Amino acid sequence: VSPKTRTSNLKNGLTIASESNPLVQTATVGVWIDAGSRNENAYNNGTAHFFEHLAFKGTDKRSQHQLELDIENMGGHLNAYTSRESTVYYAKSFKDDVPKSVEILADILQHSKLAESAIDREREVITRELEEVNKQYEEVVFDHLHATAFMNQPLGRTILGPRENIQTITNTELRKFITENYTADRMVLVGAGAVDHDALVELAEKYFSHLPSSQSPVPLGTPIPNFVGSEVRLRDDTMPVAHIAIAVEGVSWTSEDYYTALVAQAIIGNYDRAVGTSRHQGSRLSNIVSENNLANSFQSFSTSYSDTGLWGIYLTSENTTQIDDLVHFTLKEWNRLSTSVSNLQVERAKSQLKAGLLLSLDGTTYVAEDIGRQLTTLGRRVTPAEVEAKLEAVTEHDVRAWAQKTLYDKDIALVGLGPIEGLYDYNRIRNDMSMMRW
Amino acid sequence: YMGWWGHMGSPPQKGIAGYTISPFAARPFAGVVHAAIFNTFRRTKNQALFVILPVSFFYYVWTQASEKNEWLYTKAGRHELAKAL
């Protein structure tokens, strides 16, 4: 049994959440924000990512160089990332360097210069990032997957934004974005590892007390997405490996089917030829794929957002004449979630997940990320006892009922990159979403 | 000159992104009225001469031949028929 997650508020509405571990000597403190690219419109798309680059380029007090030195002198590091619905800024340090790190984070968030000279400098750095993501095939595939699944909607936009916006983002637009979005009622200060909660609340009162509150404070993790069955083909015969993602519309964080979707995802599971144990996994798809050399890897996923999600699988394969078999057998395993799954598969997946959801939380950064994600999506940290109860409530009937409404005979979004000549057209893929024998 | 899926015999393809939407997401008869009127008119107008010229020529040839043959086997065409045989 892990220590209890303590939670306090300030007056502005900033949440402080902490989980202490007296066995470690390092701490991760940071700010999780319920805001991301999805909060931009089409004209300022890219702003949130632009800000993340400028948050490190100097404040009213410390110049870029002083900032560098101050963190170097701490001993630890700072990190940030922007997603579609979430932004994180955190600092990993030593136990007794926590007040320094909170002070630096508070500075870069509230008091950043966003000097025209620095905007102009980063405008090139970011322009170069547009031409180098091209190499990260999984990210290329998932960004096209969101673009097509949520065609012309805010979830479909990239985080970097178009080249055109990068050239026209001003300090005004940057300032407006962070003033509207980085409000106290949307922020959580999180500490994990060697942190005292009461110490962290004092540091919050010292540094984050003059944060703006929003006019209309909605609860944390408050959001309509209209999924488009569609495909993007990015054929490149010179690539040796095909990357394919197939997804249907999945479940939001607060769906009643959230755990049912996780159990279904665990029934298909993951596979990687380079891992020794993967040839012996229990998953039927794993057995088909490994015995027939159909793929180098596959990874099932169930991504959630505030008001929608994507559930599906990501495949990589060098077997370019049997991509049809790989896709065929994958979708026939999905069909079986509707037609055939019994307590055998369901109870096996629940066993595996009951541990899996706990095992993931290893180091302080994973714990902090878990507290931050749960607080900004659900408004609370869910205790492992509650999670164990929700998993136990998933029956085979629930899985079959969910698959019949979510997977069976449904439209998919499909992205293929690389030597995908053998990937058949949309209809033949989508026809595998049902079985004529059933 | 034709391979099979995965090795069809195409020169290497690179740089083309292709996009389409599900048959269930689309209106199959979108723009049907415009197509049926304007597209058919364009396609027909551009091929009309290649049908009209040979059809009209061979129909004229036939019409003249059939009318002459009919006339030769009347009373009036007795003399011209006698010469023709």
XYZ file of C-alpha atoms in Angstrom:
523
model
C 0.000 0.000 0.000
C 1.446 3.289 -1.288
C 1.264 6.500 0.871
C -1.872 8.647 0.548
C -1.920 11.472 -2.010
C -2.486 14.713 -0.130
C -4.404 17.508 -1.862
C -4.845 21.159 -0.884
C -6.126 24.287 -2.623
C -5.112 27.936 -2.497
C -7.600 30.828 -2.593
C -7.082 31.514 -6.313
C -8.003 27.865 -6.938
C -4.583 26.373 -7.546
C -4.522 22.721 -6.513
C -1.481 21.316 -4.706
C -1.108 17.533 -4.761
C 1.741 15.507 -3.342
C 2.847 11.960 -2.675
C 5.888 11.514 -0.391
C 8.333 8.587 -0.550
C 10.811 8.631 2.410
C 12.969 5.989 0.668
C 14.153 8.269 -2.150
C 16.378 11.327 -1.965
C 15.212 13.103 -5.133
C 11.908 14.906 -5.827
C 9.906 15.838 -8.925
C 7.862 19.054 -8.514
C 5.993 20.618 -11.397
C 2.910 22.293 -12.789
C 0.354 20.291 -14.741
C -1.948 22.510 -16.783
C -5.313 21.573 -18.213
C -4.561 23.370 -21.502
C -2.791 22.462 -24.716
C -2.876 22.830 -28.497
C -6.597 22.098 -28.532
C -7.163 25.519 -26.996
C -5.749 27.282 -30.042
C -7.803 28.200 -33.109
C -6.578 27.800 -36.682
C -4.814 31.172 -36.757
C -2.709 30.745 -33.618
C -2.205 26.999 -33.945
C 1.339 26.373 -32.749
C 1.299 28.999 -29.976
C 1.351 26.564 -27.035
C 4.379 24.793 -28.480
C 6.021 28.125 -29.278
C 5.575 29.237 -25.658
C 7.283 26.095 -24.334
C 10.412 27.154 -26.302
C 10.293 30.705 -24.927
C 9.616 29.797 -21.320
C 13.285 28.812 -21.261
C 14.583 31.928 -22.997
C 14.641 34.309 -20.012
C 12.403 36.131 -17.555
C 12.115 39.649 -16.124
C 14.802 38.780 -13.513
C 17.028 36.070 -14.986
C 18.364 36.335 -18.544
C 18.650 33.210 -20.698
C 22.174 32.710 -19.368
C 21.286 33.299 -15.731
C 18.399 30.819 -16.089
C 20.826 28.183 -17.442
C 23.243 28.802 -14.573
C 20.544 28.764 -11.872
C 19.347 25.314 -12.939
C 22.903 24.043 -13.404
C 23.603 25.194 -9.833
C 20.520 23.362 -8.516
C 21.970 20.085 -9.735
C 18.849 18.617 -11.311
C 17.059 19.463 -14.533
C 13.862 21.022 -15.844
C 11.604 19.487 -18.457
C 8.444 20.467 -20.329
C 6.002 19.039 -22.841
C 2.894 20.245 -24.608
C 0.210 17.875 -25.844
C -3.243 18.422 -27.342
C -4.979 18.729 -23.978
C -2.195 19.008 -21.405
C 0.929 21.046 -20.708
C 3.544 20.058 -18.113
C 6.542 21.922 -16.677
C 8.498 20.087 -14.043
C 11.795 20.078 -12.190
C 13.663 17.068 -10.869
C 16.011 17.928 -8.033
C 17.533 16.922 -4.717
C 15.360 16.835 -1.588
C 16.518 20.205 -0.299
C 16.648 21.948 -3.688
C 12.856 21.882 -3.974
C 12.265 25.538 -2.930
C 14.690 26.673 -5.666
C 12.958 24.613 -8.321
C 9.459 25.799 -7.372
C 10.730 29.381 -7.545
C 12.242 28.892 -10.987
C 9.069 27.244 -12.335
C 6.909 30.045 -10.952
C 9.200 32.551 -12.650
C 9.241 31.043 -16.129
C 5.436 30.638 -16.131
C 4.387 34.003 -14.761
C 7.206 36.370 -15.627
C 8.662 35.298 -18.981
C 10.059 38.035 -21.238
C 8.840 36.841 -24.681
C 11.202 39.372 -26.227
C 10.754 40.065 -29.983
C 14.415 39.139 -30.492
C 13.858 35.680 -28.965
C 10.585 35.119 -30.833
C 12.514 35.794 -34.040
C 15.365 33.448 -33.110
C 13.084 30.496 -32.180
C 10.997 31.051 -35.293
C 13.846 29.385 -37.225
C 14.479 26.591 -34.706
C 10.818 25.618 -34.840
C 10.815 25.892 -38.631
C 13.626 23.291 -38.683
C 11.587 21.001 -36.389
C 8.948 20.778 -39.146
C 11.494 19.000 -41.374
C 12.915 16.519 -38.823
C 9.808 14.980 -37.206
C 9.732 13.308 -40.665
C 12.176 10.766 -39.217
C 10.112 9.808 -36.143
C 7.820 7.409 -37.961
C 5.565 6.592 -35.057
C 4.931 10.303 -34.488
C 4.305 10.904 -38.185
C 1.765 8.089 -38.148
C -0.009 9.273 -35.023
C -0.171 12.869 -36.113
C -1.736 11.861 -39.430
C -4.056 9.583 -37.511
C -5.434 12.481 -35.432
C -5.574 14.740 -38.479
C -7.782 12.324 -40.388
C -9.869 10.890 -37.527
C -10.806 14.374 -36.371
C -10.776 15.988 -39.799
C -10.988 19.828 -39.583
C -11.564 19.782 -35.852
C -9.274 21.127 -33.039
C -8.152 17.612 -31.988
C -7.027 17.066 -35.553
C -4.468 19.896 -35.552
C -0.763 19.321 -35.039
C 0.993 20.636 -31.955
C 3.702 22.460 -33.961
C 1.140 24.134 -36.175
C 1.535 25.087 -39.856
C 4.712 26.771 -41.234
C 2.624 29.880 -41.975
C 1.721 30.395 -38.293
C 5.268 29.880 -37.150
C 6.250 32.890 -39.281
C 3.433 35.082 -37.901
C 3.259 34.284 -34.158
C 3.784 37.524 -32.179
C 4.560 38.135 -28.498
C 0.987 39.500 -28.259
C -0.577 36.202 -29.322
C 1.766 34.323 -27.007
C 0.853 36.564 -24.056
C -2.853 36.322 -24.816
C -2.686 32.537 -24.946
C -0.976 32.101 -21.589
C -3.186 34.718 -19.955
C -6.392 33.042 -21.053
C -5.287 29.461 -20.440
C -2.654 29.307 -17.686
C -5.076 30.184 -14.901
C -4.986 28.932 -11.356
C -8.153 26.881 -11.598
C -6.600 24.956 -14.503
C -3.264 24.271 -12.830
C -2.010 21.673 -10.397
C 1.269 21.946 -8.498
C 2.454 18.392 -8.018
C 5.238 17.007 -5.851
C 6.411 13.408 -5.716
C 9.310 11.742 -3.903
C 11.125 13.552 -1.114
C 8.636 16.412 -0.707
C 6.657 17.490 2.318
C 3.093 18.458 1.414
C 2.954 21.265 3.979
C 6.238 22.679 2.677
C 4.949 22.569 -0.894
C 1.731 24.390 0.057
C 3.804 27.171 1.636
C 5.934 27.472 -1.509
C 2.716 27.663 -3.538
C 1.446 30.509 -1.359
C 4.766 32.270 -1.883
C 5.106 31.961 -5.631
C 1.794 31.100 -7.207
C -0.557 33.239 -5.161
C -0.790 36.104 -7.681
C -2.035 33.785 -10.495
C -5.165 34.952 -12.418
C -8.362 33.025 -11.826
C -10.619 32.368 -14.825
C -13.986 34.180 -14.970
C -15.964 30.914 -15.164
C -14.145 28.177 -13.141
C -15.219 24.819 -14.548
C -13.955 21.618 -12.761
C -10.607 20.127 -13.791
C -10.759 17.913 -16.885
C -13.826 19.588 -18.408
C -14.030 19.499 -22.260
C -18.106 17.949 -30.035
C -15.666 15.542 -31.813
C -17.178 13.890 -34.861
C -14.911 10.996 -35.940
C -14.300 10.572 -39.692
C -13.719 7.066 -41.052
C -10.903 7.752 -43.496
C -7.388 6.902 -44.564
C -4.060 8.559 -45.244
C -1.555 6.659 -47.363
C 2.022 7.896 -47.356
C 3.586 5.327 -49.574
C 7.388 5.366 -49.684
C 8.908 2.404 -51.470
C 12.395 3.337 -50.318
C 11.548 2.682 -46.655
C 12.124 -0.959 -45.570
C 9.517 -0.987 -42.771
C 5.784 -0.291 -43.157
C 4.107 1.562 -40.267
C 0.336 1.184 -40.015
C -2.139 2.492 -37.464
C -5.804 1.527 -37.376
C -8.151 3.122 -34.874
C -11.808 3.582 -34.094
C -13.318 6.287 -31.939
C -12.563 5.253 -28.353
C -13.479 6.489 -24.882
C -12.913 9.643 -22.849
C -11.245 9.733 -19.422
C -14.552 9.786 -17.649
C -16.412 7.303 -19.834
C -18.250 4.513 -18.062
C -16.474 2.209 -20.508
C -12.982 3.444 -19.695
C -11.929 0.224 -17.940
C -13.777 -1.987 -20.375
C -11.790 -0.412 -23.198
C -8.502 -1.031 -21.285
C -9.344 -4.667 -20.710
C -10.229 -5.109 -24.388
C -6.924 -3.488 -25.349
C -5.063 -5.900 -23.037
C -6.701 -8.917 -24.693
C -4.974 -7.976 -27.954
C -1.860 -6.648 -26.228
C 1.570 -5.818 -27.599
C 4.255 -7.725 -29.372
C 7.887 -7.108 -30.307
C 10.057 -9.699 -32.065
C 13.145 -8.293 -30.340
C 11.908 -9.150 -26.868
C 12.611 -12.772 -25.917
C 9.356 -13.471 -24.095
C 7.101 -12.165 -26.886
C 6.981 -15.486 -28.748
C 5.344 -17.058 -25.702
C 2.604 -14.500 -24.976
C -0.980 -15.696 -24.487
C -2.620 -13.235 -26.915
C -3.997 -14.919 -30.019
C -2.800 -12.103 -32.285
C 0.660 -12.402 -30.777
C 0.700 -16.131 -31.622
C -0.488 -15.624 -35.208
C 1.961 -12.811 -35.858
C 4.969 -14.495 -34.314
C 4.393 -17.931 -35.930
C 3.968 -16.423 -39.379
C 6.586 -13.621 -39.117
C 3.969 -11.079 -40.039
C 5.362 -8.092 -38.142
C 8.320 -6.719 -36.213
C 5.972 -5.269 -33.648
C 2.484 -4.221 -32.745
C 1.201 -2.066 -29.893
C -2.453 -1.771 -28.894
C -3.469 1.607 -27.576
C -6.444 3.281 -25.999
C -5.837 7.054 -26.016
C -8.355 9.192 -24.088
C -9.230 12.854 -24.238
C -11.738 14.900 -22.288
C -14.606 14.164 -24.702
C -13.440 11.384 -27.066
C -10.578 8.938 -27.626
C -8.933 6.670 -30.186
C -8.690 2.916 -29.615
C -6.638 0.858 -32.018
C -3.334 -0.715 -32.896
C -0.006 0.383 -34.327
C 1.869 -2.215 -36.447
C 5.350 -2.301 -37.940
C 6.339 -4.815 -40.567
C 9.078 -5.646 -43.086
C 6.939 -8.387 -44.554
C 5.704 -6.363 -47.463
C 3.931 -9.179 -49.303
C 1.899 -10.188 -46.285
C 0.635 -6.855 -45.023
C -2.790 -8.058 -46.130
C -2.459 -11.093 -43.786
C -1.241 -8.940 -40.930
C -4.173 -6.559 -41.256
C -6.634 -9.386 -41.896
C -5.589 -11.336 -38.781
C -5.492 -8.241 -36.622
C -9.038 -7.244 -37.516
C -10.299 -10.807 -37.146
C -8.939 -10.751 -33.566
C -10.880 -7.542 -32.985
C -14.023 -9.248 -34.347
C -13.614 -11.880 -31.621
C -13.989 -9.250 -28.905
C -17.590 -9.044 -30.152
C -18.283 -12.669 -30.974
C -16.116 -15.042 -28.928
C -14.489 -13.581 -25.837
C -15.333 -15.410 -22.665
C -14.234 -15.223 -19.051
C -11.015 -16.963 -20.082
C -9.611 -13.958 -21.998
C -11.324 -11.378 -19.795
C -10.036 -12.767 -16.491
C -6.553 -13.198 -17.921
C -6.471 -9.532 -19.065
C -7.840 -8.245 -15.771
C -5.067 -10.117 -13.887
C -2.409 -8.579 -16.118
C -3.906 -5.038 -15.734
C -4.395 -5.052 -11.975
C -0.591 -5.223 -11.747
C 0.145 -3.227 -14.908
C -1.586 -0.051 -13.653
C 0.549 -0.146 -10.485
C 3.882 -1.308 -11.992
C 4.061 1.696 -14.341
C 4.552 3.998 -11.318
C 8.249 3.396 -10.701
C 10.247 6.599 -10.102
C 9.218 10.023 -8.820
C 8.620 11.391 -12.307
C 6.160 8.613 -13.128
C 4.347 9.173 -9.866
C 4.213 12.928 -10.462
C 2.999 12.336 -13.986
C 0.292 10.048 -12.653
C -0.893 12.491 -10.013
C -0.797 15.351 -12.523
C -2.615 13.479 -15.283
C -5.343 12.146 -12.969
C -5.899 15.536 -11.307
C -6.184 17.367 -14.633
C -8.448 14.771 -16.328
C -10.645 13.469 -13.497
C -10.281 16.170 -10.853
C -8.989 13.659 -8.284
C -6.362 10.963 -7.800
C -8.069 7.604 -7.873
C -6.826 5.274 -5.112
C -5.571 1.768 -6.167
C -8.462 0.243 -4.190
C -10.989 2.093 -6.373
C -9.070 1.117 -9.493
C -9.046 -2.513 -8.392
C -12.826 -2.362 -7.871
C -13.523 -0.765 -11.275
C -11.378 -3.402 -13.025
C -13.112 -6.184 -11.118
C -16.464 -4.850 -12.270
C -15.548 -5.532 -15.929
C -17.244 -8.759 -17.046
C -17.067 -10.666 -20.331
C -20.544 -9.379 -21.034
C -19.275 -5.792 -20.689
C -16.403 -6.448 -23.089
C -18.687 -8.066 -25.688
C -21.254 -5.313 -25.331
C -18.597 -2.606 -25.665
C -16.960 -4.216 -28.688
C -20.303 -4.655 -30.411
C -21.030 -0.922 -30.095
C -17.507 0.413 -30.666
C -15.682 -1.973 -32.972
C -18.090 -4.248 -34.715
C -18.824 -3.083 -38.289
C -17.547 0.441 -37.510
C -15.570 2.938 -39.579
C -11.859 3.053 -38.952
C -9.225 5.694 -39.426
C -6.222 4.144 -41.095
C -2.751 5.532 -41.718
C -0.077 3.695 -43.656
C 3.490 4.851 -44.139
C 6.303 3.218 -46.115
C 6.157 0.220 -48.518
C 2.382 -0.219 -48.253
C 1.523 -1.302 -51.781
C 0.156 -4.516 -50.209
C -2.199 -2.609 -47.932
C -5.607 -3.012 -49.633
C -8.023 -0.124 -50.217
C -10.318 1.240 -47.497
C -13.309 -1.051 -48.290
C -11.396 -4.313 -48.021
C -9.874 -3.194 -44.711
C -13.201 -1.951 -43.364
C -14.914 -5.204 -44.470
C -12.746 -7.032 -41.951
C -14.508 -5.115 -39.174
C -17.251 -7.731 -39.246
C -17.521 -11.457 -39.825
C -20.056 -12.825 -42.313
C -20.124 -16.131 -40.375
C -21.575 -14.347 -37.311
C 4.837 -7.118 -66.787
C 2.577 -7.355 -63.800
C 3.693 -8.646 -60.404
C 1.354 -9.018 -57.447
C 0.415 -7.112 -54.282
C 3.590 -5.890 -52.605
C 5.660 -6.192 -55.813
C 3.350 -4.977 -58.530
C 6.163 -3.659 -60.784
C 5.646 0.068 -60.177
C 8.727 2.331 -60.336
C 9.421 3.389 -56.698
C 6.756 5.717 -55.341
C 7.625 8.514 -52.958
C 6.149 11.885 -52.016
C 2.472 11.216 -52.770
C 0.013 11.392 -49.905
C -3.399 9.888 -50.677
C -6.571 10.624 -48.740
C -10.104 9.316 -48.836
C -13.155 8.882 -46.618
C -15.320 5.890 -45.668
C -18.298 4.933 -47.922
C -20.479 5.293 -44.818
C -19.191 8.833 -44.239
C -19.787 10.029 -47.802
C -22.866 10.911 -49.802
C -22.608 8.436 -52.735
C -24.823 10.644 -54.920
C -23.141 13.955 -54.044
C -23.170 16.280 -57.063
C -25.164 13.818 -59.176
C -27.385 16.457 -60.791
C -24.459 18.600 -61.898
C -22.662 15.500 -63.210
C -25.708 14.140 -65.004
C -26.275 17.449 -66.805
C -23.024 19.352 -67.198
C -20.452 16.565 -67.078
C -22.397 14.409 -69.520
C -22.875 17.384 -71.799
C -19.144 18.153 -71.838
C -18.155 14.536 -72.437
C -20.738 14.087 -75.195
C -20.024 17.379 -76.928
C -16.320 16.483 -77.156
C -16.950 13.109 -78.778
C -19.939 14.041 -80.971
C -18.118 14.495 -84.336
C -16.461 11.055 -84.148
C -19.871 9.430 -84.082
C -21.867 11.828 -86.219
C -19.525 12.013 -89.214
C -19.230 8.240 -89.976
C -22.821 7.476 -89.020
C -24.190 10.268 -91.197
C -21.964 9.348 -94.122
C -22.806 5.647 -94.150
C -26.480 6.390 -93.627
C -26.463 8.702 -96.608
C -24.735 6.074 -98.774
C -27.329 3.486 -97.711
C -30.263 5.841 -98.307
C -29.091 6.627 -101.823
C -28.431 2.964 -102.658
C -31.745 1.752 -101.255
C -33.700 4.477 -103.020
C -32.033 3.751 -106.353
C -32.627 0.030 -105.968
C -36.277 0.686 -105.222
C -36.623 2.937 -108.267
C -34.918 0.505 -110.622
C -37.594 -2.111 -109.848
C -40.501 0.165 -110.697
C -42.066 0.600 -114.162
C -40.311 3.963 -114.522
C -36.926 2.327 -113.869
C -37.340 -0.437 -116.472
C -34.810 0.921 -118.930
C -32.173 1.864 -116.383
C -32.588 -1.594 -114.840
C -32.075 -3.253 -118.221
C -28.757 -1.412 -118.604
C -27.719 -2.125 -115.004
C -28.053 -5.849 -115.716
